[PDB]
């Protein structure tokens, strides 16, 4: 079993970088007739890899679907990868590292990259909200609502 | 090598809101 | 359309925007560990589109790739589309406009969309050389044909 | 009118770039 | 063994980059709760410097001012520089190098560097329209003639 | 041999277009 | 006045934005002659501002002064301001959140804004390591001692 | 209560190197 103690751990960011950029505007020439903020639909995937020993390379995938009315406006997908040299963590701690924390570092860069390609496609402004992967990860390990059943009784 | 995840393709991101398209 | 005389020559840029963007760096962390020796090969492809009567769109697909033989460092491909409100001209004269001049307008934008893309992927800056599509078109047209008609008079 | 063309796989030119990428 | 055609022009991009970047929203949270009605005052500038013999430095200073009447929303500015090795052409053509040809290369980079800063300050999409500084320079200095385009095509 | 840059102080282009904003 | 929200701990991130950005490459093409990772010095400065009841902003000032050889390479500073709706926590616990955790939310976006300007100024990429300000704040508080004669005597 | 700050211009660390200058 996981017979490791002492909350020390260590990693250093070796490299942050975009691995993939995508922007498909299929209706673009015609859809510009509709001057409006196209309805945003978010997608998020997270991958990792082993380059060398203690050297793990996490890939954050963000995909943004958008449409003016009932027809597509734009489709902008970015994959912000990152090399991190991790040690000390294991079990729940390593699942928190590569499954939440490592994507959460890459997230601002993935955001600016999406907005760049939307700007290049001459579509309205796109700013994605900060998703705290680490907080929602803690809730994932239980898959249930928070327990704080009390009786203040203010009347 | 020291660790290894299932490689969560399916995430857990939930939000009762949107971007706020004004 | 109600055309009862002859619409005279006009060139106006209605819009410029990337209709498609693609970046593939699968070996992005591989080449970090390799020696930086990329073969920067450019691939020029051009597409045409009729949006309306006398409204015509030219899409310059600038496909950039860098591969050391068996392994690809990066791929940076941008279908830089431009809607152009033009009329008055047609045939071979127009084949110069939409087939040389109009993608040459799109070329600084496509250059930058790729240059920024590689820098976001943590690859050294790639500024594509100024390609005179019009001069190249003269070679296809009638082997140089004329060219160098620069009368050169100052104000 | 100013229309009636089609697409083509390349015009007539690739270009082989080579910076000081070392 | 003869001086064959002087007018080829030796132009090569050495390195393109931002000499300077700025974004100022000192009243940012207060101006976000304000009525959207910006007076878009663009201040364009182009200045050049000799680094060494025929080593040409061009800078394109693009400033965006958004004033909602008396209230300024933001002041963004990018000075998109670019080193270029150049020879072959002189006089009014040297003036047109800094006048249009080089700012035109630097223009999409200048645009995206602003639009990044605007998005960082969480304001809407501001994109600069295609300004053909060449056509505009011809009325100023050197009424330049076009390409020597002949009528011929056979297939 | 060709170019001897001093300085540049003229913007003939006074700008007659907006950034899509109103 | 929507003060002291008492219905479980509240912390809603309303907005992330740049209130100020300044990148300068003072000696830019002269300093590129030294194509090396410049000697960097980072500075952190904290600020914060009450916008409304339970609505509190934190402005993280992240500075990077860099130099190659005997001259400055690149200068960078970003006031990454962030709006946070805080409640359920108070006094030292709230000061721990607002002076460590909230700057730590601003810190990925602070780094990113800098990193992008470094790559736009074409200097070698700046991926700053992520620091746990939360724990360092605790060890910062427990520092009030005048013992230990720090001599340092070379011979 | 809600607030309760006590900020200083000195905080955490300084670092006159960082990264790993080759």
XYZ file of C-alpha atoms in Angstrom:
708
model
C 0.000 0.000 0.000
C 0.913 3.757 0.015
C 3.365 3.686 2.986
C 4.644 7.255 2.387
C 4.323 10.194 4.880
C 5.510 13.822 5.497
C 3.748 16.463 3.324
C 6.934 17.806 1.648
C 6.609 17.016 -2.148
C 8.386 18.901 -5.005
C 8.014 19.818 -8.667
C 9.469 22.489 -10.932
C 7.832 23.718 -14.157
C 10.252 22.646 -16.908
C 8.161 24.024 -19.778
C 4.655 25.460 -20.436
C 3.633 25.422 -24.116
C 0.739 24.982 -26.537
C 0.724 21.535 -28.287
C -2.434 22.065 -30.384
C -4.471 25.018 -31.733
C -7.737 24.661 -33.636
C -10.281 27.167 -34.950
C -12.972 26.103 -37.451
C -15.461 28.763 -38.621
C -17.677 26.664 -41.067
C -20.558 29.225 -41.438
C -18.187 32.262 -40.981
C -18.836 34.447 -44.231
C -22.619 34.117 -43.789
C -22.991 33.924 -39.956
C -21.477 37.481 -39.512
C -24.925 38.828 -40.636
C -25.896 38.116 -36.971
C -24.056 40.680 -34.785
C -24.309 38.985 -31.330
C -22.234 37.043 -28.722
C -22.601 33.345 -30.019
C -23.809 30.865 -27.336
C -20.794 29.327 -25.516
C -20.623 25.558 -24.843
C -17.521 24.365 -22.931
C -15.573 21.067 -23.106
C -12.548 20.043 -20.972
C -10.265 16.939 -21.261
C -6.994 16.254 -19.318
C -4.140 13.919 -20.400
C -0.582 13.218 -19.143
C 2.512 11.312 -20.438
C 5.932 9.976 -19.292
C 8.919 11.540 -21.160
C 11.633 10.572 -18.677
C 11.747 9.452 -15.030
C 9.892 11.866 -12.647
C 9.240 13.921 -15.828
C 5.520 13.879 -16.600
C 3.960 16.003 -19.360
C 0.308 17.021 -18.762
C -1.945 18.209 -21.605
C -4.928 20.457 -20.858
C -7.598 20.338 -23.624
C -10.253 23.093 -23.786
C -12.886 23.048 -26.562
C -15.358 25.920 -27.117
C -18.439 25.440 -29.295
C -20.410 28.559 -30.337
C -23.457 29.260 -32.508
C -25.480 32.307 -33.685
C -29.136 31.324 -33.358
C -29.327 27.613 -34.379
C -26.355 27.625 -36.872
C -22.630 27.337 -35.954
C -20.606 30.547 -35.487
C -17.152 29.222 -34.531
C -15.448 26.172 -32.993
C -12.200 27.008 -31.075
C -10.151 24.229 -29.401
C -6.735 24.655 -27.713
C -4.445 22.128 -26.012
C -2.015 23.723 -23.540
C 0.593 21.082 -22.602
C 3.240 21.376 -19.903
C 6.304 19.477 -18.664
C 6.486 19.154 -14.805
C 9.120 17.109 -12.828
C 7.046 15.687 -9.912
C 8.169 13.749 -6.769
C 6.985 13.027 -3.176
C 3.248 12.778 -4.032
C 1.426 9.413 -4.442
C -2.126 7.935 -4.217
C -4.702 10.759 -3.821
C -1.858 13.370 -3.827
C -0.577 12.337 -7.343
C -4.157 12.213 -8.681
C -4.506 15.810 -7.347
C -1.165 16.785 -8.997
C -1.562 15.624 -12.649
C -5.411 15.455 -12.496
C -6.167 18.985 -11.170
C -3.148 21.160 -10.207
C -0.964 20.733 -13.363
C -3.996 21.639 -15.747
C -4.870 24.596 -13.375
C -1.368 26.131 -14.085
C -1.845 25.721 -17.877
C -5.420 27.204 -17.867
C -4.608 31.068 -18.334
C -2.451 30.246 -21.424
C -5.192 27.969 -22.941
C -7.689 30.870 -22.358
C -5.512 33.557 -24.130
C -4.855 31.084 -27.019
C -8.665 30.473 -27.563
C -9.381 34.244 -27.454
C -6.522 34.842 -29.972
C -8.088 32.484 -32.589
C -11.617 33.908 -32.000
C -10.118 37.407 -32.565
C -8.427 36.134 -35.759
C -11.854 34.808 -36.890
C -13.328 38.339 -36.212
C -15.905 36.880 -33.711
C -17.083 38.665 -30.398
C -15.096 38.591 -27.091
C -14.390 35.241 -25.304
C -13.151 35.183 -21.615
C -13.503 31.799 -19.834
C -14.064 31.827 -16.006
C -11.311 30.389 -13.596
C -12.242 26.692 -13.016
C -10.728 25.544 -9.661
C -9.933 21.941 -10.754
C -8.433 21.163 -7.290
C -11.651 22.107 -5.374
C -14.016 20.144 -7.692
C -11.486 17.224 -7.627
C -11.959 16.953 -3.810
C -15.754 16.663 -4.448
C -15.136 14.076 -7.269
C -13.519 11.624 -4.769
C -16.863 11.461 -2.871
C -19.410 12.230 -5.683
C -21.967 13.772 -3.247
C -23.282 17.102 -1.851
C -21.482 18.772 1.129
C -22.589 17.832 4.695
C -23.283 20.873 6.948
C -26.763 19.975 8.323
C -27.388 22.526 11.173
C -30.285 24.369 12.871
C -29.666 28.142 13.101
C -33.465 28.801 13.362
C -33.730 32.566 12.707
C -37.363 33.800 12.999
C 6.930 5.492 -12.897
C 6.725 6.498 -9.158
C 3.031 7.309 -9.903
C 0.479 6.784 -12.717
C -3.141 8.030 -13.169
C -6.076 6.419 -15.099
C -5.688 9.560 -17.351
C -9.104 11.171 -16.692
C -10.552 11.933 -20.158
C -13.914 12.512 -18.403
C -13.664 15.520 -15.995
C -15.828 16.819 -13.088
C -16.201 20.579 -13.919
C -19.719 21.774 -12.852
C -20.989 25.422 -12.732
C -24.505 26.883 -12.157
C -23.746 29.827 -14.540
C -22.446 30.746 -18.038
C -19.746 33.095 -19.530
C -22.148 36.074 -19.205
C -22.567 36.957 -22.904
C -23.537 40.658 -22.818
C -28.755 41.949 -60.397
C -30.142 45.092 -62.150
C -26.991 45.933 -64.208
C -27.864 48.391 -67.059
C -24.432 49.820 -68.121
C -21.089 48.467 -66.763
C -19.847 48.479 -63.144
C -16.261 49.983 -63.198
C -13.118 48.519 -61.480
C -13.156 48.554 -57.641
C -11.102 46.813 -54.901
C -12.424 46.948 -51.310
C -11.606 44.523 -48.484
C -14.957 43.553 -46.929
C -13.270 41.431 -44.176
C -10.068 39.436 -43.254
C -10.204 36.488 -40.825
C -8.872 32.975 -40.292
C -11.652 30.556 -41.388
C -9.478 27.606 -40.309
C -6.484 27.287 -37.965
C -4.537 24.099 -37.130
C -1.439 23.443 -34.957
C -0.040 19.947 -34.382
C 2.980 19.499 -32.089
C 2.614 15.782 -30.937
C 6.439 15.541 -30.643
C 6.618 18.996 -28.957
C 8.177 17.404 -25.681
C 10.254 14.980 -27.901
C 12.090 17.809 -29.743
C 12.687 19.460 -26.318
C 14.928 16.375 -25.678
C 16.181 16.235 -29.345
C 18.711 18.677 -30.887
C 16.968 21.739 -32.477
C 17.494 20.907 -36.208
C 14.056 21.493 -37.976
C 13.380 21.479 -41.770
C 11.069 24.518 -42.192
C 9.191 23.619 -45.405
C 6.377 25.921 -46.588
C 3.361 24.639 -48.588
C 1.190 27.297 -50.360
C -2.430 26.298 -51.188
C -5.225 28.678 -52.354
C -9.038 28.362 -52.345
C -11.864 30.386 -53.964
C -15.462 31.141 -52.800
C -18.516 32.952 -54.336
C -20.515 34.565 -51.492
C -22.690 36.748 -53.776
C -22.908 38.504 -57.157
C -19.705 40.650 -57.371
C -18.812 39.542 -53.769
C -15.878 37.102 -53.966
C -13.703 35.554 -51.247
C -10.112 34.245 -51.490
C -8.703 31.877 -48.810
C -4.869 31.627 -48.599
C -3.968 28.331 -46.851
C -0.371 28.827 -45.607
C 0.759 25.349 -44.445
C 4.015 25.518 -42.452
C 5.797 22.352 -41.308
C 9.096 21.495 -39.609
C 10.124 17.798 -39.564
C 13.599 16.248 -38.962
C 13.092 13.245 -41.279
C 10.972 10.760 -39.278
C 9.804 13.118 -36.449
C 7.704 16.312 -36.886
C 8.671 19.226 -34.566
C 5.549 21.293 -35.354
C 2.833 21.884 -37.994
C 1.271 25.392 -38.271
C -1.487 25.703 -40.913
C -3.789 28.724 -41.345
C -6.571 29.137 -43.932
C -6.485 32.958 -43.847
C -9.745 33.907 -45.588
C -10.600 37.351 -46.902
C -13.924 38.605 -48.242
C -13.325 41.161 -51.060
C -15.993 43.481 -52.546
C -14.584 43.764 -56.126
C -16.069 44.408 -59.623
C -15.303 45.942 -63.053
C -12.503 43.461 -63.864
C -12.647 39.750 -64.884
C -10.709 36.950 -66.720
C -6.850 36.964 -66.625
C -6.636 40.490 -65.082
C -8.863 39.210 -62.235
C -6.903 35.891 -62.112
C -3.946 38.140 -61.103
C -6.103 39.958 -58.469
C -7.667 36.911 -56.649
C -4.758 34.523 -57.545
C -1.806 36.781 -56.572
C -2.633 40.244 -55.081
C -5.549 39.237 -52.758
C -3.650 36.231 -51.059
C -0.602 38.652 -50.877
C -2.885 40.967 -48.769
C -3.812 37.935 -46.599
C -0.111 36.784 -46.384
C 1.130 39.232 -43.524
C -1.923 38.140 -41.428
C -1.313 34.385 -42.088
C 2.450 34.892 -41.410
C 1.655 36.387 -37.962
C -1.095 33.793 -37.154
C 1.678 31.144 -37.595
C 4.526 33.224 -36.021
C 2.493 33.811 -32.822
C 1.335 30.124 -32.903
C 4.927 28.690 -32.843
C 5.932 31.181 -30.056
C 2.857 30.036 -28.006
C 4.051 26.427 -28.592
C 7.541 27.426 -27.285
C 9.224 27.151 -30.704
C 11.691 29.927 -31.929
C 10.068 32.730 -34.003
C 9.286 31.925 -37.666
C 8.912 35.012 -39.899
C 7.986 33.782 -43.420
C 9.935 35.520 -46.264
C 8.019 38.207 -48.362
C 6.623 36.109 -51.281
C 5.614 38.232 -54.322
C 2.730 36.043 -55.657
C 2.201 38.654 -58.425
C 5.779 38.256 -59.771
C 5.368 34.430 -59.552
C 2.021 34.765 -61.390
C 3.779 36.688 -64.253
C 6.014 33.581 -64.759
C 2.860 31.372 -65.017
C 1.048 34.106 -67.058
C 3.461 34.331 -70.063
C 7.013 33.786 -68.547
C 7.634 37.216 -66.814
C 5.294 38.786 -69.511
C 6.031 42.457 -68.628
C 6.690 43.509 -64.983
C 8.870 46.431 -63.722
C 6.295 49.011 -64.972
C 7.150 51.181 -61.892
C 7.067 54.636 -63.615
C 8.370 56.168 -60.351
C 7.222 59.815 -59.994
C 7.342 61.534 -56.557
C 4.774 64.087 -55.329
C -19.754 39.920 -62.409
C -16.239 38.995 -61.137
C -16.794 35.270 -60.319
C -16.970 31.664 -61.696
C -13.641 30.101 -60.514
C -12.813 27.006 -58.398
C -10.211 25.754 -55.851
C -6.769 24.230 -56.728
C -4.316 22.087 -54.663
C -1.378 24.622 -54.630
C -0.857 27.502 -57.120
C 2.676 26.747 -58.482
C 5.061 27.331 -55.491
C 5.994 25.770 -52.073
C 8.974 27.896 -50.753
C 11.730 26.190 -48.635
C 12.522 28.379 -45.556
C 15.685 27.967 -43.413
C 16.316 30.338 -40.466
C 19.239 30.133 -37.973
C 17.241 27.573 -35.921
C 20.030 26.046 -33.780
C 29.991 40.358 -66.594
C 27.334 43.137 -66.816
C 25.111 45.059 -64.319
C 21.803 43.217 -65.136
C 18.592 44.757 -63.618
C 19.384 46.790 -60.420
C 15.728 46.722 -59.237
C 15.406 43.311 -57.470
C 15.613 44.697 -53.856
C 17.506 42.641 -51.209
C 14.911 42.514 -48.375
C 15.194 39.904 -45.592
C 13.354 39.860 -42.240
C 15.998 39.532 -39.478
C 13.683 39.556 -36.418
C 10.159 40.939 -35.595
C 9.146 41.727 -31.962
C 7.567 44.178 -29.498
C 10.000 46.993 -28.417
C 7.310 48.112 -25.962
C 3.880 47.000 -24.672
C 1.446 48.881 -22.416
C -2.107 48.628 -21.059
C -3.543 51.127 -18.547
C -6.988 50.806 -16.881
C -6.368 52.610 -13.464
C -10.164 52.924 -12.945
C -10.835 49.392 -14.362
C -13.611 48.067 -11.829
C -15.291 51.560 -11.800
C -15.245 51.860 -15.635
C -16.648 48.255 -16.035
C -19.924 49.395 -14.292
C -20.077 52.346 -16.818
C -22.254 52.880 -19.959
C -20.538 51.432 -23.087
C -20.094 54.291 -25.651
C -16.287 54.534 -26.543
C -14.712 57.334 -28.637
C -12.144 55.148 -30.432
C -9.159 57.490 -30.934
C -6.367 55.531 -32.634
C -2.916 57.202 -32.614
C -0.693 55.603 -35.274
C 3.064 56.259 -35.489
C 5.966 54.846 -37.529
C 9.619 55.624 -36.719
C 12.868 54.083 -38.033
C 16.507 53.854 -36.838
C 19.843 52.846 -38.439
C 21.488 50.095 -36.283
C 24.328 49.397 -38.717
C 25.083 49.984 -42.422
C 21.841 49.081 -44.358
C 20.480 47.322 -41.209
C 17.056 48.941 -41.012
C 14.997 49.113 -37.775
C 11.282 49.923 -38.227
C 8.812 50.464 -35.385
C 5.022 50.721 -35.620
C 3.457 52.408 -32.553
C -0.292 51.671 -32.445
C -2.195 53.316 -29.559
C -5.868 52.695 -28.785
C -7.756 55.269 -26.704
C -11.334 54.428 -25.612
C -13.031 57.451 -23.972
C -16.699 57.009 -22.886
C -17.158 60.827 -23.102
C -15.021 62.273 -20.259
C -14.320 58.845 -18.680
C -11.403 56.880 -20.263
C -12.048 53.080 -20.353
C -8.423 52.193 -21.176
C -5.186 53.329 -22.866
C -3.414 50.452 -24.708
C -0.201 50.792 -26.784
C 2.178 48.447 -28.608
C 5.364 49.457 -30.438
C 5.833 46.615 -32.933
C 9.453 46.769 -34.070
C 11.191 44.775 -36.766
C 14.822 44.475 -37.880
C 15.231 44.110 -41.670
C 18.454 43.808 -43.770
C 17.836 45.910 -46.943
C 19.643 47.027 -50.161
C 18.993 47.803 -53.871
C 16.369 50.636 -53.677
C 16.894 54.247 -52.420
C 15.459 57.823 -52.341
C 11.628 57.925 -52.206
C 11.703 54.065 -52.197
C 13.797 54.211 -48.948
C 11.051 56.526 -47.572
C 8.362 54.042 -48.765
C 10.236 51.193 -46.961
C 9.531 52.879 -43.560
C 6.400 54.511 -45.079
C 4.375 51.361 -45.760
C 6.196 48.138 -46.772
C 7.759 47.399 -43.315
C 4.798 48.783 -41.060
C 2.553 46.450 -43.240
C 4.657 43.427 -42.170
C 4.530 44.574 -38.512
C 0.787 45.572 -38.620
C -0.948 42.111 -37.843
C 1.572 41.573 -34.949
C 0.811 45.093 -33.582
C -2.957 44.336 -33.869
C -2.856 40.953 -31.994
C -0.564 42.361 -29.214
C -3.203 45.106 -28.522
C -6.211 42.735 -28.757
C -4.425 40.440 -26.246
C -4.054 43.414 -23.777
C -7.724 44.459 -24.355
C -8.905 40.881 -23.596
C -6.577 40.817 -20.520
C -8.358 43.970 -19.281
C -11.629 42.098 -20.139
C -12.921 44.738 -22.652
C -14.716 43.631 -26.015
C -12.950 42.658 -29.324
C -11.054 45.665 -30.813
C -9.466 44.748 -34.216
C -7.817 47.308 -36.571
C -9.182 47.322 -40.183
C -6.791 46.459 -43.174
C -4.961 49.776 -43.807
C -3.052 49.658 -47.144
C -0.315 52.170 -46.108
C 1.223 51.703 -49.654
C -1.781 53.177 -51.520
C -1.972 55.958 -48.901
C 1.832 56.664 -49.161
C 1.557 57.115 -52.980
C -0.536 60.333 -52.521
C 2.033 61.491 -49.868
C 5.443 60.614 -51.493
C 6.103 58.613 -54.741
C 3.045 57.865 -56.921
C 4.168 54.235 -57.425
C 2.895 52.217 -60.462
C 1.474 48.653 -60.088
C 2.562 45.239 -61.478
C 3.367 44.806 -65.202
C 0.373 42.515 -65.665
C -0.103 41.354 -69.289
C -3.308 39.749 -70.693
C -2.516 36.050 -71.481
C -3.574 32.578 -70.205
C -3.471 29.169 -71.969
C -4.408 25.745 -70.502
C 26.047 51.531 -48.870
C 22.353 52.315 -49.630
C 20.382 53.321 -46.487
C 21.250 56.126 -44.009
C 18.231 56.594 -41.657
C 17.992 59.851 -39.648
C 14.392 60.051 -38.216
C 10.622 60.142 -39.173
C 7.995 62.662 -37.764
C 5.038 62.619 -40.308
C 1.792 60.549 -40.202
C -0.175 61.750 -43.282
C -2.750 59.022 -42.372
C -5.041 60.827 -39.854
C -7.297 57.637 -39.635
C -10.997 57.644 -40.851
C -12.243 54.241 -39.474
C -13.361 52.759 -36.111
C -12.553 49.397 -34.364
C -16.126 48.058 -34.782
C -17.147 49.836 -31.524
C -19.962 52.417 -31.177
C -25.408 46.941 2.359
C -25.048 43.161 1.618
C -22.543 42.719 4.497
C -21.420 39.481 6.292
C -23.131 36.712 4.231
C -23.777 33.940 6.815
C -24.984 30.888 4.814
C -21.792 28.720 4.655
C -18.318 30.121 3.608
C -18.612 32.292 0.445
C -15.857 32.915 -2.125
C -17.132 33.704 -5.647
C -14.489 34.832 -8.187
C -16.329 37.603 -10.088
C -13.497 38.685 -12.481
C -9.732 38.440 -13.386
C -8.162 41.288 -15.379
C -5.062 43.395 -15.931
C -5.390 46.933 -14.490
C -1.813 47.704 -15.604
C 0.782 46.149 -17.945
C 4.275 47.464 -18.872
C 6.803 45.505 -21.013
C 9.955 47.343 -22.190
C 12.822 45.916 -24.246
C 15.057 49.058 -23.759
C 18.129 47.887 -25.766
C 16.062 45.237 -27.693
C 18.136 44.460 -30.963
C 21.494 45.413 -29.367
C 20.807 43.115 -26.396
C 19.678 40.214 -28.758
C 23.398 39.999 -29.784
C 23.580 38.206 -26.416
C 21.148 35.366 -27.348
C 20.994 33.843 -23.831
C 18.432 33.387 -20.970
C 18.801 36.880 -19.250
C 19.644 37.145 -15.522
C 16.138 37.738 -14.021
C 15.053 39.307 -10.718
C 11.345 38.913 -9.819
C 9.502 41.221 -7.371
C 6.107 40.754 -5.708
C 4.015 43.596 -4.269
C 0.516 43.076 -2.831
C -2.462 45.448 -2.862
C -6.237 45.226 -2.289
C -9.367 47.469 -2.484
C -12.914 47.228 -0.995
C -15.292 47.701 -3.996
C -18.556 47.025 -2.109
C -19.947 45.125 0.938
C -18.388 41.561 0.963
C -16.848 42.458 -2.455
C -13.094 42.758 -2.161
C -10.469 43.105 -4.893
C -6.822 42.020 -4.687
C -4.264 43.584 -7.077
C -1.116 41.429 -7.502
C 1.909 43.421 -8.806
C 4.362 40.945 -10.418
C 7.652 42.444 -11.688
C 10.531 40.956 -13.761
C 13.709 43.038 -14.262
C 16.160 41.118 -16.529
C 19.687 41.857 -17.870
C 22.226 40.445 -20.402
C 25.918 41.275 -19.773
C 26.347 44.907 -18.620
C 22.944 46.130 -19.985
C 19.205 45.554 -19.332
C 17.518 42.797 -21.386
C 13.773 43.082 -20.670
C 11.497 44.817 -18.163
C 8.007 43.586 -17.249
C 5.342 44.406 -14.626
C 1.653 43.413 -14.473
C -0.919 44.586 -11.894
C -3.218 41.535 -12.184
C -6.370 42.702 -10.313
C -9.098 40.227 -9.292
C -12.614 40.737 -7.861
C -13.633 38.190 -5.116
C -16.945 38.028 -3.131
C -15.759 36.915 0.376
C -17.823 35.904 3.497
C -17.987 33.342 6.353
C -14.282 34.081 7.145
C -12.968 37.087 9.155
C -9.940 38.787 10.786
C -6.694 36.761 10.542
C -8.421 33.906 8.578
C -9.716 36.390 5.948
C -6.282 38.168 5.877
C -4.726 34.697 5.249
C -7.143 34.208 2.308
C -6.829 37.750 0.862
C -3.016 38.116 1.383
C -1.962 34.591 0.225
C -4.760 32.484 -1.420
C -6.324 35.280 -3.583
C -2.785 36.449 -4.892
C -2.176 32.668 -5.562
C -5.330 32.723 -7.847
C -3.924 35.880 -9.542
C -0.410 34.293 -9.806
C -1.047 31.858 -12.865
C -2.636 34.812 -14.786
C 0.182 37.180 -13.627
C 2.853 34.730 -14.866
C 0.956 34.158 -18.178
C 0.634 37.912 -18.994
C 4.422 38.295 -18.412
C 5.325 35.037 -20.304
C 3.386 36.140 -23.414
C 5.133 39.596 -23.495
C 8.562 37.918 -23.095
C 7.782 35.696 -26.152
C 6.335 38.752 -28.063
C 9.607 40.617 -27.270
C 11.215 37.320 -28.497
C 13.324 36.815 -25.311
C 13.673 33.090 -24.118
C 10.434 31.944 -22.374
C 9.693 32.764 -18.707
C 7.834 29.898 -16.925
C 7.852 30.957 -13.256
C 7.445 28.099 -10.706
C 4.143 27.993 -8.641
C 4.659 29.019 -4.970
C 2.364 28.044 -2.059
C 1.864 31.569 -0.609
C -0.617 30.086 1.939
C 2.024 28.121 3.934
C 4.770 30.759 3.374
C 2.357 33.393 4.911
C 2.195 31.306 8.143
C 6.040 31.144 8.329
C 6.168 34.897 7.446
C 3.926 35.759 10.475
C 6.138 33.855 13.012
C 9.273 36.024 12.246
C 10.112 38.457 15.097
C 13.686 37.841 16.367
C 16.958 39.860 16.520
C 19.386 37.039 17.521
C 22.224 35.713 15.292
C 25.235 37.932 14.417
C 25.448 37.595 10.581
C 29.166 38.415 10.064
C 30.435 36.961 6.705
C 34.269 37.350 6.636
C 36.133 36.344 3.416
C 39.940 35.845 3.499
C -16.739 40.412 11.231
C -15.623 40.402 7.515
C -12.278 42.269 7.001
C -9.075 42.477 9.144
C -5.965 43.217 7.002
C -2.379 44.166 7.925
C -0.368 44.432 4.624
C 3.374 45.260 4.152
C 5.514 46.066 1.042
C 7.853 43.175 2.026
C 6.219 39.722 1.613
C 7.281 36.040 1.279
C 10.611 36.199 -0.744
C 12.806 38.298 -3.141
C 14.732 35.864 -5.514
C 17.655 37.407 -7.527
C 18.118 34.401 -9.880
C 15.066 32.033 -10.161
C 14.466 29.617 -13.142
C 17.933 28.069 -13.639
C 20.185 30.372 -15.738
C 22.287 28.021 -17.990
